[PDB]
Amino acid sequence: TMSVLGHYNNFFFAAHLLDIAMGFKTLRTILSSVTHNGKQLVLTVGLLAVVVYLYTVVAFNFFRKFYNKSEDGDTPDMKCDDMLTCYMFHMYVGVRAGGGIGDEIEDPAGDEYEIYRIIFDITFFFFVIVILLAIIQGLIIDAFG
Amino acid sequence: FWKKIIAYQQKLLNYFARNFYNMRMLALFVAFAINFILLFYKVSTIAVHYVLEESSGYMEPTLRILAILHTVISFFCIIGYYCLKVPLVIFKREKEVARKLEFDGLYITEQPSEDDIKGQWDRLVINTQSFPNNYWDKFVKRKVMDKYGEFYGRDRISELLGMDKAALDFSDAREKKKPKKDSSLSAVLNSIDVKYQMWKLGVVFTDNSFLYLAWYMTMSVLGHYNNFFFAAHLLDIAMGFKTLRTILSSVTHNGKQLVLTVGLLAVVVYLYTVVAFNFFRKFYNKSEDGDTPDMKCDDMLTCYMFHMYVGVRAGGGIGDEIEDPAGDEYEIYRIIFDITFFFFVIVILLAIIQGLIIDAFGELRDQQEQVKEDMETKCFICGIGNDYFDTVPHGFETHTLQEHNLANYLFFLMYLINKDETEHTGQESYVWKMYQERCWEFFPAGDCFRKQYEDQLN
Amino acid sequence: ELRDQQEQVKEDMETKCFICGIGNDYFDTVPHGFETHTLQEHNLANYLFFLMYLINKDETEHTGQESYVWKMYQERCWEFFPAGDCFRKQYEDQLN
Amino acid sequence: VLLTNLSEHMPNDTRLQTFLELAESVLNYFQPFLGRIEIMGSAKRIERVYFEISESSRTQWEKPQVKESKRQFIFDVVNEGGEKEKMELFVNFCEDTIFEMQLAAQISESSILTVRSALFALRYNILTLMRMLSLKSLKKQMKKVKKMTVKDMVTAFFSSYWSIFMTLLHFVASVFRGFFRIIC
Ligand SMILES: Nc1ncnc2c1ncn2[C@@H]1O[C@H](COP(=O)(O)OP(=O)(O)OP(=O)(O)O)[C@@H](O)[C@H]1O
Ligand SMILES: Nc1ncnc2c1ncn2[C@@H]1O[C@H](COP(=O)(O)OP(=O)(O)OP(=O)(O)O)[C@@H](O)[C@H]1O
Ligand SMILES: [Zn+2]
Ligand SMILES: [Zn+2]
């Protein structure tokens, strides 16, 4: 079916490159590391989403003022005025960020919640960026072993 | 009247105990539904007004109904715990106290350490007339009386164990006959043992799972005042799903090692902050404007917080976030500073955390493999290897499923406990006496029927 | 590697005696035989205590066995340590 | 020592067993102090040797640091060890341990309040929950149960556990306040 659709759109022929896994059994053993603990990986991603949702709840209830993402003073682009927007901001930006959500949100200096927000950022970095990605690392390596 | 009130109370108890787990999963499902509704929750505008924003408009009654239902289910889960798991905890505690009284003399020969809250609290249950309420052995007081009465003193042993020997002697001797009417409400009220209920309530309150369920109910109640308090119930997924048990075990297997690694990271970063504060203060200007410099290392506390917060999270270390060292008398020293910080903190220590988690995974897998290998290669009871039995085809499995089945041994203990002592046969009486004296010599260790009768059988 | 080394140490100490080196199964033919052997018959703590007792004892007061062990210890001859043999293995038929 | 030697070299003697029961108390007393090893004797035979272990030696051997030294030595000999030098390394370890135990012997010279506060909180909070039965305030419940209602039954059943949960809340609050007072 994909080969037939390729005549209508030639870029439908790119799905046939997914056949290399079955064609070469050498890729079988590399992909088995991922698929050996695929359920564990999916559960780890779900746990990451739950933890990030809890962090987003905390930020939405206490640290809304720091999520202005627009540099111009005329129009503020608030990324945590809505729960859905704040959760998407967290999952999309903070997780991909090397240092966590604190790398991408405003600076906390000179505020009454400075220590609380420092704890927030450090715990986010430790649990999400370090520990959970470490769980994925360990799952793949343990599958190999 | 009372025979039906108590019957219906028992029916409700049984229903809640049966459905404890179903109500336990229902509470997680309702929590997930509430937290899914909470994703459509908006700030509306000098007081800020949190408003549930949706097109349908029906999610607000849905949210209130779900909150009330979650609170009801949490209360019902507490009731189900009290009906189902509390009896097991009380049985275990009563068994442990009885064994420490009989075979250790925990309140006759030597006294508790005053640092054991369990030991100090268990002092109350001894005097109660409702002791072994859950534990089957109702003769533990008599056993302790026989064991320590002649040496430590009959009267004080009886006072400690709460036994009225003089009343027992009078009852055994000639006595008047007195009826007992359970219908009297005063009799119903005075029948209950207050002190034993006190001890049981203390044990239940000190139980960890009951405390966790009380915390669950408290957070559910607080959720009505603030709907975002319902997010703490998503922490229950770890206990709800045992699939998350094995993922989280990698973290918790070496949790002490992880905490110590974080402490070591703080010490190393503190040493680096000391060095920077003593030699590299000029490079910690963080304000781009020349008018006002924002010095991040003029104070020791500020410099330490700057390091721990910014440099550790930075991909390349503190050098990624501090000024450039080019054209300075300490250029080489600061380059060494930054490179060593990157290597020790960013690379090595995070590598230690990586290795701890991966080694926890490997260790758990090895433990499971060891359990499987032991159970497949040697019998649980006798301990003889599989090959000796496998000399006969399917001999190991025949031995471990017919001759030395641990399930069969458990069923024998149940049968012997539930059987009347007078009806015991010779073998049953022998095993019963050894079990009462906690002598496990009757368990075949290193020998079996096939090994004893090797030549006769074959 | 460190975890494997610890596991190997535990496995060796649980499966073979430190002194004689005989496996656990041979002693375990008798119930609790391995533990009886390694805590009463071939206890390394008992061997250390014997060395202390023999050193602190006067050489003139040594018995025959003590003098034999003392001479071998002074010449650093460890043949008196039972290797591959024990009381139960030597007197296997007489004891049982 | 004589009786132990006789019993262990004639394991199937009923008369010797009777003597052992007659001498149980002395043997029990001297059991900690009685040493027992096996050696290859001069007669090409495994011989069992009995000696005396002193109380000081036993205590210094059971000192925790000596146990750490033992564990380290066992780890070393098992991992980086060859069977040739096992008995030489063991003798070296024994000599060092003997010297350090003698040194320790010669240098030798001849939460509670938190638990109490928690127990007090338990006692008081449970007494408050039980004062309703103690006071004989059951006349009110009896008046509600003049006439049966299944709704009344359900309400009382839920109210009992609700009161238990409230008492647990009070207990937790009391523990927190007591801990704060202690740390203050
Ligand atoms: N005393 C014993 N009783 C039962 N099984 C034993 C015993 N000793 C060894 N085994 C071995 O244990 C295995 C049986 O495992 P077990 O009964 O614990 O559960 P399982 O096979 O994992 O599955 P399930 O949970 O369905 O019972 C068999 O390989 C059996 O040979
Ligand atoms: N010659 C021996 N002496 C003592 N134990 C031995 C010997 N050979 C093997 N073992 C085994 O070693 C284990 C005893 O270990 P060891 O005495 O080193 O300390 P442990 O059990 O780890 O604890 P602790 O430090 O409290 O003594 C037992 O399993 C025992 O069977
Ligand atoms: Zn068996
Ligand atoms: Zn040995």
Curated annotation (Swiss-Prot), chain C:
Detected in heart muscle (at protein level). Heart muscle, brain (cerebellum and hippocampus) and placenta. Induction: By TGFB1. Changing residue 67 to F: In VACRDS; decreased function in release of sequestered calcium ion into cytosol by sarcoplasmic reticulum; changed ryanodine-sensitive calcium-release channel activity; mutant channels are less respositive to activation by caffeine and store calcium overload; affects channel sensitivity to cytosolic and luminal calcium activation. It is found in: Sarcoplasmic reticulum membrane. Channel activity is modulated by phosphorylation. Phosphorylation is increased in failing heart, leading to calcium leaks and increased cytoplasmic Ca(2+) levels. Changing residue 84 to E: Found in a patient with intellectual disability, seizures, short stature and severe atrial arrhythmias; likely pathogenic. Residues 1-96 are cytoplasmic. Cytosolic calcium-activated calcium channel that mediates the release of Ca(2+) from the sarcoplasmic reticulum into the cytosol and thereby plays a key role in triggering cardiac muscle contraction. Aberrant channel activation can lead to cardiac arrhythmia. In cardiac myocytes, calcium release is triggered by increased Ca(2+) cytosolic levels due to activation of the L-type calcium channel CACNA1C. The calcium channel activity is modulated by formation of heterotetramers with RYR3. Required for cellular calcium ion homeostasis. Required for embryonic heart development. Belongs to the ryanodine receptor (TC 1.A.3.1) family. RYR2 subfamily. The calcium release channel activity resides in the C-terminal region while the remaining part of the protein resides in the cytoplasm. Homotetramer. Can also form heterotetramers with RYR1 and RYR3. Interacts with FKBP1A and FKBP1B; these interactions may stabilize the channel in its closed state and prevent Ca(2+) leaks. Interacts with CALM and S100A1; these interactions regulate channel activity. Identified in a complex composed of RYR2, FKBP1B, PKA catalytic subunit, PRKAR2A, AKAP6, and the protein phosphatases PP2A and PP1. Interacts directly with FKBP1B, PKA, PP1 and PP2A. Interacts with SELENON. In cardiac muscles, identified in a complex, composed of FSD2, CMYA5 and RYR2. This is Ryanodine receptor 2. It comes from Homo sapiens (Human). The gene is RYR2. The chain holds residues 4872 to 4967 of 4967 of the full protein.
Swiss-Prot record, chain D:
Changing residue 9 to Q: Changed ryanodine-sensitive calcium-release channel activity characterized by increased sensitivity to cytosolic calcium activation. Detected in heart muscle (at protein level). Heart muscle, brain (cerebellum and hippocampus) and placenta. It comes from the Eukaryota. Channel activity is modulated by phosphorylation. Phosphorylation is increased in failing heart, leading to calcium leaks and increased cytoplasmic Ca(2+) levels. Changing residue 60 to P: In CPVT1; changed ryanodine-sensitive calcium-release channel activity; increased sensitivity to cytosolic calcium activation. The chain crosses the membrane at residues 156-176. Cytosolic calcium-activated calcium channel that mediates the release of Ca(2+) from the sarcoplasmic reticulum into the cytosol and thereby plays a key role in triggering cardiac muscle contraction. Aberrant channel activation can lead to cardiac arrhythmia. In cardiac myocytes, calcium release is triggered by increased Ca(2+) cytosolic levels due to activation of the L-type calcium channel CACNA1C. The calcium channel activity is modulated by formation of heterotetramers with RYR3. Required for cellular calcium ion homeostasis. Required for embryonic heart development. Homotetramer. Can also form heterotetramers with RYR1 and RYR3. Interacts with FKBP1A and FKBP1B; these interactions may stabilize the channel in its closed state and prevent Ca(2+) leaks. Interacts with CALM and S100A1; these interactions regulate channel activity. Identified in a complex composed of RYR2, FKBP1B, PKA catalytic subunit, PRKAR2A, AKAP6, and the protein phosphatases PP2A and PP1. Interacts directly with FKBP1B, PKA, PP1 and PP2A. Interacts with SELENON. In cardiac muscles, identified in a complex, composed of FSD2, CMYA5 and RYR2. This is Ryanodine receptor 2. It comes from Homo sapiens (Human). The gene is RYR2.
